[PDB]
Design a protein around this ligand. Structure first.
Ligand code: HEM
Length: 153
């Protein structure tokens, strides 16, 4: 359970993300795909992209970055009371898109890296720990729905 102080740190940096959702979404998906190439293979939409330059030029990848960060932002602004928003996301990522929990750990590392790079004055170590905790809470609760459905592994 995050404290109110930890939520404030998370949502303070998140409001900075919201000034450039698309740019962040690009940088986070590119870092995920470069750091963990197995993740790119899960997207038939993107698996043609073979260089970072082709990634950065793809408008469809930039669109999907916005989709991902808009969904994450709506879950973070619920401060933990996010059951309605996670149900459908866990259901599609377990049963349709076939994404292991560990790749949600990987995209959480890429989100934390990109926020540190873009917002270092609002993303010191207090806020990095709080955002770590918020992304762990997201993973914990998606993993419980995976397990329900027979996909925790
Ligand atoms: C912060 C974590 C994530 C969030 C909030 C998120 C959110 C979303 C949303 C909102 C959609 C479209 C609606 C849906 O299908 O449920 C989607 C689609 C999808 N996601 Fe995620 N996602 C996340 C992580 C990942 C990861 C780590 C992968 C792959 C490694 C992944 C793979 C996919 C795929 C393959 C689609 C379908 C894309 C398409 O072909 O249009 N997701 N995601």
């Amino acid at each position: 359970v995050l404290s109110e102080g930890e939520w404030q740190l998370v949502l303070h940096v998140w409001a900075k993300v919201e000034a450039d959702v698309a740019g962040h979404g690009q940088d986070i998906l590119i870092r995920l795909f470069k750091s963990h190439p197995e993740t790119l293979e899960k997207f038939d939409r993107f698996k043609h992209l073979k260089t970072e330059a082709e990634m950065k030029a793809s408008e469809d990848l930039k669109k999907h970055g916005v989709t991902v960060l808009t969904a994450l932002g709506a879950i973070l602004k619920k401060k933990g009371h996010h059951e309605a928003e996670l149900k459908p996301l866990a259901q599609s990522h377990a049963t349709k898109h076939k994404i292991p929990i560990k790749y949600l750990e990987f995209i959480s590392e890429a989100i934390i890296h990109v926020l540190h790079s873009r917002h270092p004055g609002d993303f010191g170590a207090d806020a990095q720990g709080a955002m770590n905790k918020a992304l762990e809470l997201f993973r914990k609760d998606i993993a419980a729905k995976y397990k329900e459905l027979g996909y925790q592994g």
